[PDB]
Amino acid sequence: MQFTLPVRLCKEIELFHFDIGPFENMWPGIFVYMVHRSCGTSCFELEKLCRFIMSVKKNYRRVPYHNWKHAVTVAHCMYAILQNNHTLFTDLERKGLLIACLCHDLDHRGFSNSYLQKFDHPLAALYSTSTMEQHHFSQTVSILQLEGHNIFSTLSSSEYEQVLEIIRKAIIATDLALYFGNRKQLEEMYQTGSLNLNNQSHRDRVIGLMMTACDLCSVTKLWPVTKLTANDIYAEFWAEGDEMKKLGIQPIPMMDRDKKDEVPQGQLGFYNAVAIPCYTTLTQILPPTEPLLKACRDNLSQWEKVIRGE
Ligand SMILES: Cc1ccc2c(c1)nc(CCc1coc3ccc(Cl)cc3c1=O)n2-c1ccccc1
Ligand SMILES: [Mg+2]
Ligand SMILES: [Zn+2]
């Protein structure tokens, strides 16, 4: 609670390319700041917000990427978006989505969904698809229910089971698998013109690309930030290969450390089939979010430079 943000950062936070990298002591305080800026200071009672942000944090684990730094970075990109699109997302929405971004990878083990299903893993036995995603939501609801943690208490029960729904939904949308379709349908509603923010399930579709665009925002940071975030990402994937190898199974080339050489090519393919389309359809639906796609291009061409050896 006692925290105040080094007033020097007040403008640099509102950047789409801000990097929370150097400021780890401040990561819990930043989120609060981003909450306070959006839904006001007296949105949640200050005391039950700190319990919450702090429980949440402890339930992120020591893994290379799907960690506490990751989550807060996702909450940051959602912050930026919600602000650069101020009068177009309801009171409750801005409450739901920042919490959801902060929680959308709770208790992440560091292993893919495909891993947990290839090997009949207990969580995959619980959740038949979006194995972690539903667990991330399962963790979120669980932690709300702790004595003195239910920040959504003074919402009417009805608004309270709308928050949740946004949160469950927005967390499930982070399964890339679902991303591809969700973005295709949105590319058609735009072409067609039949996309209508009044209709609830178009918003849910837009929220989901908003969730994806946040999830991938490390691709939208400054090149020396992004280059050193990628190391975090593969570190994990290559662990997930190291376990696939230990059984005498060849991992996919994405998760194989023996092919570190091929990563520049691999990154570049990723931006062209995932990142760039995501921020393109997003910028078509939320024009102010063009800085993400602008920095996504910039970063992409950096990998092209590294492929071409410059
Ligand atoms: C040898 C090799 C072959 C394929 C490769 C690769 C290396 N690296 C990749 C990309 C790996 C990858 C996967 O998920 C992400 C999620 C979020 C963010 Cl910010 C970045 C990534 C990311 O970099 N692919 C890949 C390419 C296209 C689609 C999917 C993965
Ligand atoms: Mg996840
Ligand atoms: Zn994520």
mmCIF file of C-alpha atoms and ligand atoms in Angstrom:
data_model
loop_
_atom_site.group_PDB
_atom_site.id
_atom_site.type_symbol
_atom_site.label_atom_id
_atom_site.label_comp_id
_atom_site.label_asym_id
_atom_site.label_seq_id
_atom_site.Cartn_x
_atom_site.Cartn_y
_atom_site.Cartn_z
ATOM 1 C CA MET A 1 0.000 0.000 0.000
ATOM 2 C CA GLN A 2 2.655 2.468 1.145
ATOM 3 C CA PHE A 3 4.128 2.593 -2.384
ATOM 4 C CA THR A 4 4.331 5.672 -4.625
ATOM 5 C CA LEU A 5 5.670 5.545 -8.183
ATOM 6 C CA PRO A 6 8.955 7.399 -8.971
ATOM 7 C CA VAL A 7 7.206 10.354 -10.618
ATOM 8 C CA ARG A 8 9.823 10.193 -13.382
ATOM 9 C CA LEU A 9 8.088 7.063 -14.676
ATOM 10 C CA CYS A 10 4.641 8.687 -14.871
ATOM 11 C CA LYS A 11 4.952 9.434 -18.567
ATOM 12 C CA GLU A 12 7.067 6.432 -19.534
ATOM 13 C CA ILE A 13 4.486 4.046 -18.091
ATOM 14 C CA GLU A 14 1.872 5.248 -20.616
ATOM 15 C CA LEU A 15 4.122 4.145 -23.476
ATOM 16 C CA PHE A 16 3.122 1.094 -25.507
ATOM 17 C CA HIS A 17 6.789 0.015 -25.538
ATOM 18 C CA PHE A 18 7.556 0.493 -21.846
ATOM 19 C CA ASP A 19 9.741 -2.194 -20.263
ATOM 20 C CA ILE A 20 9.169 -3.038 -16.616
ATOM 21 C CA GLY A 21 12.541 -4.820 -16.869
ATOM 22 C CA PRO A 22 14.731 -2.642 -14.641
ATOM 23 C CA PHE A 23 12.024 -2.048 -12.055
ATOM 24 C CA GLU A 24 11.316 -5.342 -10.275
ATOM 25 C CA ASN A 25 11.005 -3.931 -6.738
ATOM 26 C CA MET A 26 8.236 -1.762 -8.264
ATOM 27 C CA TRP A 27 6.283 -4.406 -10.241
ATOM 28 C CA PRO A 28 3.529 -4.843 -7.590
ATOM 29 C CA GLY A 29 3.397 -1.100 -7.065
ATOM 30 C CA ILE A 30 3.234 -0.413 -10.780
ATOM 31 C CA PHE A 31 0.181 -2.624 -11.251
ATOM 32 C CA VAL A 32 -1.581 -0.794 -8.405
ATOM 33 C CA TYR A 33 -0.576 2.458 -10.067
ATOM 34 C CA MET A 34 -2.041 1.212 -13.369
ATOM 35 C CA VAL A 35 -5.188 0.199 -11.505
ATOM 36 C CA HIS A 36 -5.319 3.516 -9.667
ATOM 37 C CA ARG A 37 -4.903 5.430 -12.926
ATOM 38 C CA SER A 38 -7.649 3.502 -14.675
ATOM 39 C CA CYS A 39 -10.611 2.650 -12.385
ATOM 40 C CA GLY A 40 -9.537 5.278 -9.859
ATOM 41 C CA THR A 41 -7.790 4.829 -6.531
ATOM 42 C CA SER A 42 -11.070 4.062 -4.751
ATOM 43 C CA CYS A 43 -12.014 1.319 -7.181
ATOM 44 C CA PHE A 44 -10.890 -1.501 -4.867
ATOM 45 C CA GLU A 45 -10.231 -0.976 -1.177
ATOM 46 C CA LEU A 46 -6.484 -0.486 -0.934
ATOM 47 C CA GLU A 47 -6.052 -3.162 1.727
ATOM 48 C CA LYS A 48 -7.699 -6.026 -0.136
ATOM 49 C CA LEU A 49 -5.866 -5.128 -3.333
ATOM 50 C CA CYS A 50 -2.440 -5.630 -1.757
ATOM 51 C CA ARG A 51 -3.400 -8.982 -0.260
ATOM 52 C CA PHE A 52 -4.581 -9.904 -3.742
ATOM 53 C CA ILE A 53 -1.650 -8.715 -5.846
ATOM 54 C CA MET A 54 0.665 -10.333 -3.293
ATOM 55 C CA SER A 55 -1.030 -13.729 -3.101
ATOM 56 C CA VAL A 56 -1.219 -13.753 -6.934
ATOM 57 C CA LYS A 57 2.490 -12.996 -7.158
ATOM 58 C CA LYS A 58 3.561 -15.789 -4.789
ATOM 59 C CA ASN A 59 1.527 -18.160 -6.985
ATOM 60 C CA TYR A 60 3.651 -17.354 -9.979
ATOM 61 C CA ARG A 61 6.613 -19.651 -10.001
ATOM 62 C CA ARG A 62 10.302 -19.765 -10.830
ATOM 63 C CA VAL A 63 10.183 -20.587 -14.551
ATOM 64 C CA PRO A 64 11.977 -18.797 -17.404
ATOM 65 C CA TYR A 65 9.094 -16.831 -18.943
ATOM 66 C CA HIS A 66 5.615 -17.751 -17.693
ATOM 67 C CA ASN A 67 6.399 -15.907 -14.468
ATOM 68 C CA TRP A 68 5.549 -12.850 -12.382
ATOM 69 C CA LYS A 69 7.458 -10.493 -14.694
ATOM 70 C CA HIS A 70 5.507 -11.867 -17.643
ATOM 71 C CA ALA A 71 2.072 -11.348 -16.093
ATOM 72 C CA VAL A 72 2.783 -7.788 -15.015
ATOM 73 C CA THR A 73 4.052 -7.008 -18.523
ATOM 74 C CA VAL A 74 0.779 -8.335 -19.955
ATOM 75 C CA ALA A 75 -1.191 -6.165 -17.479
ATOM 76 C CA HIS A 76 0.961 -3.255 -18.711
ATOM 77 C CA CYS A 77 0.031 -3.692 -22.387
ATOM 78 C CA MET A 78 -3.666 -3.999 -21.496
ATOM 79 C CA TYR A 79 -3.263 -0.804 -19.454
ATOM 80 C CA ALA A 80 -1.854 1.080 -22.425
ATOM 81 C CA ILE A 81 -4.613 -0.206 -24.724
ATOM 82 C CA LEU A 82 -7.456 0.586 -22.322
ATOM 83 C CA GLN A 83 -6.093 4.120 -21.921
ATOM 84 C CA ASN A 84 -5.342 4.870 -25.577
ATOM 85 C CA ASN A 85 -9.013 3.734 -26.028
ATOM 86 C CA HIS A 86 -10.532 5.482 -23.027
ATOM 87 C CA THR A 87 -14.265 5.919 -23.750
ATOM 88 C CA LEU A 88 -15.064 2.544 -25.298
ATOM 89 C CA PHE A 89 -14.681 0.015 -22.485
ATOM 90 C CA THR A 90 -17.119 -0.093 -19.608
ATOM 91 C CA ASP A 91 -16.392 0.663 -15.985
ATOM 92 C CA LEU A 92 -16.417 -3.027 -15.069
ATOM 93 C CA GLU A 93 -14.454 -4.000 -18.188
ATOM 94 C CA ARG A 94 -11.359 -2.087 -17.150
ATOM 95 C CA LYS A 95 -11.646 -3.687 -13.713
ATOM 96 C CA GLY A 96 -11.943 -7.195 -15.163
ATOM 97 C CA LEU A 97 -9.226 -7.065 -17.823
ATOM 98 C CA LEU A 98 -6.255 -5.735 -15.819
ATOM 99 C CA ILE A 99 -6.886 -8.318 -13.077
ATOM 100 C CA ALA A 100 -7.328 -10.955 -15.788
ATOM 101 C CA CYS A 101 -4.033 -10.084 -17.480
ATOM 102 C CA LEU A 102 -2.255 -10.210 -14.130
ATOM 103 C CA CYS A 103 -3.728 -13.671 -13.396
ATOM 104 C CA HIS A 104 -3.898 -15.269 -16.888
ATOM 105 C CA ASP A 105 -0.840 -17.496 -16.269
ATOM 106 C CA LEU A 106 -1.200 -18.271 -12.563
ATOM 107 C CA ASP A 107 0.598 -21.376 -11.368
ATOM 108 C CA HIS A 108 2.013 -21.969 -14.844
ATOM 109 C CA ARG A 109 4.269 -24.994 -14.774
ATOM 110 C CA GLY A 110 6.362 -24.094 -17.755
ATOM 111 C CA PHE A 111 5.030 -26.779 -19.983
ATOM 112 C CA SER A 112 2.784 -26.553 -23.049
ATOM 113 C CA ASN A 113 -0.746 -27.802 -23.286
ATOM 114 C CA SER A 114 0.384 -30.352 -25.896
ATOM 115 C CA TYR A 115 2.844 -31.705 -23.340
ATOM 116 C CA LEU A 116 0.194 -32.150 -20.637
ATOM 117 C CA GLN A 117 -2.032 -34.048 -23.065
ATOM 118 C CA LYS A 118 0.664 -36.167 -24.726
ATOM 119 C CA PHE A 119 1.407 -37.492 -21.215
ATOM 120 C CA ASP A 120 -2.027 -37.850 -19.524
ATOM 121 C CA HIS A 121 -0.969 -35.254 -16.949
ATOM 122 C CA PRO A 122 -3.374 -34.828 -13.970
ATOM 123 C CA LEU A 123 -4.358 -31.267 -14.913
ATOM 124 C CA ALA A 124 -5.022 -32.291 -18.528
ATOM 125 C CA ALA A 125 -7.241 -34.995 -17.046
ATOM 126 C CA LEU A 126 -9.136 -32.203 -15.278
ATOM 127 C CA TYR A 127 -9.290 -29.883 -18.316
ATOM 128 C CA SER A 128 -9.735 -31.502 -21.745
ATOM 129 C CA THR A 129 -8.572 -28.400 -23.701
ATOM 130 C CA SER A 130 -6.944 -25.134 -22.698
ATOM 131 C CA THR A 131 -5.429 -27.286 -19.999
ATOM 132 C CA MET A 132 -3.438 -24.540 -18.284
ATOM 133 C CA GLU A 133 -5.791 -21.716 -19.309
ATOM 134 C CA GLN A 134 -8.699 -23.130 -17.277
ATOM 135 C CA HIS A 135 -6.289 -23.818 -14.389
ATOM 136 C CA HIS A 136 -5.151 -20.170 -14.561
ATOM 137 C CA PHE A 137 -8.780 -19.215 -14.206
ATOM 138 C CA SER A 138 -9.256 -21.918 -11.558
ATOM 139 C CA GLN A 139 -6.404 -20.362 -9.634
ATOM 140 C CA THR A 140 -7.877 -16.864 -10.058
ATOM 141 C CA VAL A 141 -11.312 -17.734 -8.664
ATOM 142 C CA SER A 142 -9.687 -19.695 -5.864
ATOM 143 C CA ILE A 143 -7.547 -16.770 -4.753
ATOM 144 C CA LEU A 144 -10.439 -14.315 -4.864
ATOM 145 C CA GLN A 145 -12.255 -16.496 -2.310
ATOM 146 C CA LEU A 146 -9.518 -16.201 0.330
ATOM 147 C CA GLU A 147 -10.509 -14.396 3.497
ATOM 148 C CA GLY A 148 -10.128 -10.709 2.707
ATOM 149 C CA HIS A 149 -9.063 -11.136 -0.916
ATOM 150 C CA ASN A 150 -12.358 -10.650 -2.765
ATOM 151 C CA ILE A 151 -11.731 -7.237 -4.283
ATOM 152 C CA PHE A 152 -15.023 -7.622 -6.206
ATOM 153 C CA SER A 153 -17.098 -7.745 -3.010
ATOM 154 C CA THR A 154 -19.028 -4.459 -3.202
ATOM 155 C CA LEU A 155 -20.233 -5.237 -6.690
ATOM 156 C CA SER A 156 -23.801 -6.369 -6.880
ATOM 157 C CA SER A 157 -23.792 -10.156 -7.143
ATOM 158 C CA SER A 158 -24.912 -9.734 -10.772
ATOM 159 C CA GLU A 159 -22.058 -7.396 -11.669
ATOM 160 C CA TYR A 160 -19.883 -9.775 -9.642
ATOM 161 C CA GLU A 161 -20.733 -12.684 -11.927
ATOM 162 C CA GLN A 162 -20.065 -10.475 -14.895
ATOM 163 C CA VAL A 163 -16.512 -9.535 -13.783
ATOM 164 C CA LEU A 164 -15.849 -13.227 -13.439
ATOM 165 C CA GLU A 165 -17.176 -14.036 -16.843
ATOM 166 C CA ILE A 166 -14.947 -11.445 -18.506
ATOM 167 C CA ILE A 167 -12.047 -12.869 -16.468
ATOM 168 C CA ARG A 168 -12.686 -16.541 -17.252
ATOM 169 C CA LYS A 169 -13.297 -15.657 -20.919
ATOM 170 C CA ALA A 170 -10.311 -13.333 -21.260
ATOM 171 C CA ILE A 171 -8.029 -15.921 -19.646
ATOM 172 C CA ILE A 172 -9.243 -18.714 -21.927
ATOM 173 C CA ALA A 173 -8.653 -16.535 -24.990
ATOM 174 C CA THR A 174 -4.923 -16.546 -24.185
ATOM 175 C CA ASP A 175 -4.653 -20.085 -25.577
ATOM 176 C CA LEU A 176 -2.974 -19.196 -28.877
ATOM 177 C CA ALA A 177 -4.790 -22.175 -30.419
ATOM 178 C CA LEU A 178 -8.010 -20.204 -30.146
ATOM 179 C CA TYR A 179 -6.408 -17.014 -31.329
ATOM 180 C CA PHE A 180 -6.198 -17.961 -34.977
ATOM 181 C CA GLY A 181 -9.907 -18.440 -35.369
ATOM 182 C CA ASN A 182 -10.891 -15.536 -33.271
ATOM 183 C CA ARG A 183 -8.903 -13.285 -35.374
ATOM 184 C CA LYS A 184 -10.206 -14.662 -38.599
ATOM 185 C CA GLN A 185 -13.730 -14.043 -37.650
ATOM 186 C CA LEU A 186 -12.848 -10.597 -36.783
ATOM 187 C CA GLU A 187 -11.170 -10.053 -40.077
ATOM 188 C CA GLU A 188 -14.426 -10.937 -41.735
ATOM 189 C CA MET A 189 -16.679 -8.903 -39.610
ATOM 190 C CA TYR A 190 -14.499 -6.042 -40.585
ATOM 191 C CA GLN A 191 -14.404 -6.872 -44.290
ATOM 192 C CA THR A 192 -18.122 -7.490 -44.124
ATOM 193 C CA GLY A 193 -18.876 -4.632 -41.729
ATOM 194 C CA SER A 194 -21.145 -6.683 -39.499
ATOM 195 C CA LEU A 195 -19.029 -6.213 -36.378
ATOM 196 C CA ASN A 196 -20.989 -4.389 -33.745
ATOM 197 C CA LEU A 197 -19.578 -3.417 -30.361
ATOM 198 C CA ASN A 198 -23.153 -3.333 -29.007
ATOM 199 C CA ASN A 199 -23.475 -7.101 -29.561
ATOM 200 C CA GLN A 200 -21.767 -8.691 -26.549
ATOM 201 C CA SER A 201 -20.081 -11.613 -28.311
ATOM 202 C CA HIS A 202 -18.236 -9.291 -30.691
ATOM 203 C CA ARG A 203 -16.733 -7.493 -27.718
ATOM 204 C CA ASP A 204 -15.704 -10.852 -26.294
ATOM 205 C CA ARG A 205 -14.042 -11.531 -29.637
ATOM 206 C CA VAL A 206 -12.273 -8.149 -29.528
ATOM 207 C CA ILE A 207 -11.336 -8.615 -25.850
ATOM 208 C CA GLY A 208 -9.684 -11.880 -26.869
ATOM 209 C CA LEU A 209 -7.373 -10.359 -29.475
ATOM 210 C CA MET A 210 -6.745 -7.632 -26.887
ATOM 211 C CA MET A 211 -5.764 -10.482 -24.561
ATOM 212 C CA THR A 212 -3.592 -12.042 -27.296
ATOM 213 C CA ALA A 213 -1.968 -8.744 -28.248
ATOM 214 C CA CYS A 214 -1.058 -8.293 -24.606
ATOM 215 C CA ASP A 215 0.214 -11.849 -24.274
ATOM 216 C CA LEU A 216 2.627 -11.267 -27.176
ATOM 217 C CA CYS A 217 3.614 -7.658 -26.366
ATOM 218 C CA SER A 218 7.245 -8.602 -25.744
ATOM 219 C CA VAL A 219 7.386 -8.738 -29.504
ATOM 220 C CA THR A 220 6.358 -5.038 -29.398
ATOM 221 C CA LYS A 221 9.143 -3.791 -27.097
ATOM 222 C CA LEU A 222 12.461 -2.133 -27.929
ATOM 223 C CA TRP A 223 14.813 -4.471 -29.752
ATOM 224 C CA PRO A 224 17.330 -4.873 -26.869
ATOM 225 C CA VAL A 225 14.447 -5.593 -24.535
ATOM 226 C CA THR A 226 12.820 -7.999 -27.004
ATOM 227 C CA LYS A 227 16.082 -9.748 -27.955
ATOM 228 C CA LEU A 228 16.635 -10.578 -24.305
ATOM 229 C CA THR A 229 13.007 -11.561 -23.711
ATOM 230 C CA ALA A 230 13.296 -14.199 -26.448
ATOM 231 C CA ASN A 231 16.049 -15.901 -24.436
ATOM 232 C CA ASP A 232 13.503 -16.204 -21.641
ATOM 233 C CA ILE A 233 10.972 -17.844 -23.942
ATOM 234 C CA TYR A 234 13.196 -20.497 -25.508
ATOM 235 C CA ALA A 235 14.850 -21.331 -22.156
ATOM 236 C CA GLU A 236 11.446 -22.739 -21.248
ATOM 237 C CA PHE A 237 10.617 -24.384 -24.600
ATOM 238 C CA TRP A 238 14.059 -26.039 -24.558
ATOM 239 C CA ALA A 239 13.401 -27.392 -21.082
ATOM 240 C CA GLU A 240 10.181 -28.781 -22.589
ATOM 241 C CA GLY A 241 12.393 -30.356 -25.252
ATOM 242 C CA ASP A 242 14.952 -31.588 -22.707
ATOM 243 C CA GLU A 243 12.132 -33.678 -21.163
ATOM 244 C CA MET A 244 10.939 -34.834 -24.586
ATOM 245 C CA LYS A 245 14.507 -35.894 -25.405
ATOM 246 C CA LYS A 246 15.064 -37.629 -22.049
ATOM 247 C CA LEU A 247 12.403 -40.190 -23.128
ATOM 248 C CA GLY A 248 13.990 -40.618 -26.567
ATOM 249 C CA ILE A 249 11.419 -38.482 -28.400
ATOM 250 C CA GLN A 250 12.534 -35.724 -30.728
ATOM 251 C CA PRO A 251 10.981 -32.399 -29.690
ATOM 252 C CA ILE A 252 9.647 -29.972 -32.271
ATOM 253 C CA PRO A 253 12.346 -27.670 -33.713
ATOM 254 C CA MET A 254 10.844 -24.821 -31.687
ATOM 255 C CA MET A 255 11.770 -26.584 -28.431
ATOM 256 C CA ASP A 256 15.083 -28.134 -29.469
ATOM 257 C CA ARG A 257 18.225 -26.533 -28.073
ATOM 258 C CA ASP A 258 20.437 -28.372 -30.583
ATOM 259 C CA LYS A 259 18.931 -25.964 -33.145
ATOM 260 C CA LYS A 260 19.647 -22.625 -31.453
ATOM 261 C CA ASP A 261 21.044 -21.667 -34.850
ATOM 262 C CA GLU A 262 17.645 -21.773 -36.441
ATOM 263 C CA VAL A 263 15.929 -19.417 -33.938
ATOM 264 C CA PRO A 264 16.192 -16.194 -36.033
ATOM 265 C CA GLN A 265 14.368 -17.887 -38.926
ATOM 266 C CA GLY A 266 11.931 -19.381 -36.417
ATOM 267 C CA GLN A 267 11.181 -16.045 -34.741
ATOM 268 C CA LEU A 268 10.622 -14.435 -38.133
ATOM 269 C CA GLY A 269 8.097 -17.084 -39.155
ATOM 270 C CA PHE A 270 6.326 -16.531 -35.825
ATOM 271 C CA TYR A 271 5.903 -12.774 -36.334
ATOM 272 C CA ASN A 272 4.567 -13.344 -39.875
ATOM 273 C CA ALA A 273 2.003 -16.029 -38.942
ATOM 274 C CA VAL A 274 1.036 -14.813 -35.468
ATOM 275 C CA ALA A 275 2.216 -11.451 -34.086
ATOM 276 C CA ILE A 276 1.855 -9.194 -37.159
ATOM 277 C CA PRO A 277 -1.670 -10.409 -38.097
ATOM 278 C CA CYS A 278 -2.725 -10.059 -34.421
ATOM 279 C CA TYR A 279 -1.712 -6.419 -34.155
ATOM 280 C CA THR A 280 -2.950 -5.716 -37.694
ATOM 281 C CA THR A 281 -6.514 -6.869 -37.021
ATOM 282 C CA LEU A 282 -6.237 -5.194 -33.633
ATOM 283 C CA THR A 283 -5.122 -1.890 -35.107
ATOM 284 C CA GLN A 284 -7.972 -2.159 -37.591
ATOM 285 C CA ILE A 285 -10.387 -2.572 -34.684
ATOM 286 C CA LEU A 286 -8.587 -0.254 -32.194
ATOM 287 C CA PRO A 287 -6.767 2.314 -34.355
ATOM 288 C CA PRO A 288 -4.906 3.892 -31.390
ATOM 289 C CA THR A 289 -3.032 0.604 -30.830
ATOM 290 C CA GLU A 290 -0.877 1.197 -33.877
ATOM 291 C CA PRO A 291 2.328 1.638 -31.765
ATOM 292 C CA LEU A 292 2.249 -2.091 -30.958
ATOM 293 C CA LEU A 293 2.186 -3.039 -34.637
ATOM 294 C CA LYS A 294 4.686 -0.312 -35.508
ATOM 295 C CA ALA A 295 7.166 -1.714 -32.981
ATOM 296 C CA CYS A 296 6.204 -5.220 -34.067
ATOM 297 C CA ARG A 297 7.354 -4.405 -37.595
ATOM 298 C CA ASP A 298 10.560 -2.763 -36.269
ATOM 299 C CA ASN A 299 11.424 -5.827 -34.196
ATOM 300 C CA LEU A 300 10.573 -8.138 -37.097
ATOM 301 C CA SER A 301 13.017 -6.393 -39.433
ATOM 302 C CA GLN A 302 15.670 -6.745 -36.722
ATOM 303 C CA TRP A 303 15.432 -10.516 -36.990
ATOM 304 C CA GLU A 304 15.541 -10.214 -40.781
ATOM 305 C CA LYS A 305 18.763 -8.235 -40.302
ATOM 306 C CA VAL A 306 20.119 -11.015 -38.015
ATOM 307 C CA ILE A 307 19.066 -13.705 -40.480
ATOM 308 C CA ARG A 308 20.868 -11.768 -43.243
ATOM 309 C CA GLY A 309 23.886 -11.383 -40.866
ATOM 310 C CA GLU A 310 24.396 -7.649 -40.496
HETATM 311 C C1 LIG B 1 13.508 -23.912 -35.111
HETATM 312 C C2 LIG B 1 12.248 -23.096 -34.957
HETATM 313 C C3 LIG B 1 11.075 -23.464 -35.624
HETATM 314 C C4 LIG B 1 9.873 -22.804 -35.409
HETATM 315 C C5 LIG B 1 9.871 -21.747 -34.522
HETATM 316 C C6 LIG B 1 11.020 -21.330 -33.861
HETATM 317 C C7 LIG B 1 12.211 -22.011 -34.092
HETATM 318 N N1 LIG B 1 10.746 -20.255 -33.022
HETATM 319 C C8 LIG B 1 9.458 -20.041 -33.159
HETATM 320 C C9 LIG B 1 8.673 -19.095 -32.319
HETATM 321 C C10 LIG B 1 8.605 -19.557 -30.866
HETATM 322 C C11 LIG B 1 7.576 -18.832 -30.038
HETATM 323 C C12 LIG B 1 6.459 -19.373 -29.576
HETATM 324 O O1 LIG B 1 5.508 -18.751 -28.822
HETATM 325 C C13 LIG B 1 5.702 -17.425 -28.517
HETATM 326 C C14 LIG B 1 4.737 -16.833 -27.709
HETATM 327 C C15 LIG B 1 4.883 -15.501 -27.361
HETATM 328 C C16 LIG B 1 5.968 -14.789 -27.839
HETATM 329 CL CL1 LIG B 1 6.176 -13.127 -27.359
HETATM 330 C C17 LIG B 1 6.925 -15.371 -28.641
HETATM 331 C C18 LIG B 1 6.811 -16.718 -28.964
HETATM 332 C C19 LIG B 1 7.856 -17.413 -29.738
HETATM 333 O O2 LIG B 1 8.928 -16.879 -30.021
HETATM 334 N N2 LIG B 1 8.872 -20.889 -34.075
HETATM 335 C C20 LIG B 1 7.535 -20.846 -34.608
HETATM 336 C C21 LIG B 1 7.326 -20.370 -35.897
HETATM 337 C C22 LIG B 1 6.033 -20.149 -36.345
HETATM 338 C C23 LIG B 1 4.956 -20.417 -35.526
HETATM 339 C C24 LIG B 1 5.165 -20.928 -34.258
HETATM 340 C C25 LIG B 1 6.451 -21.150 -33.794
HETATM 341 MG MG MG B 2 -0.701 -19.491 -20.859
HETATM 342 ZN ZN ZN B 3 0.775 -15.339 -21.312
#
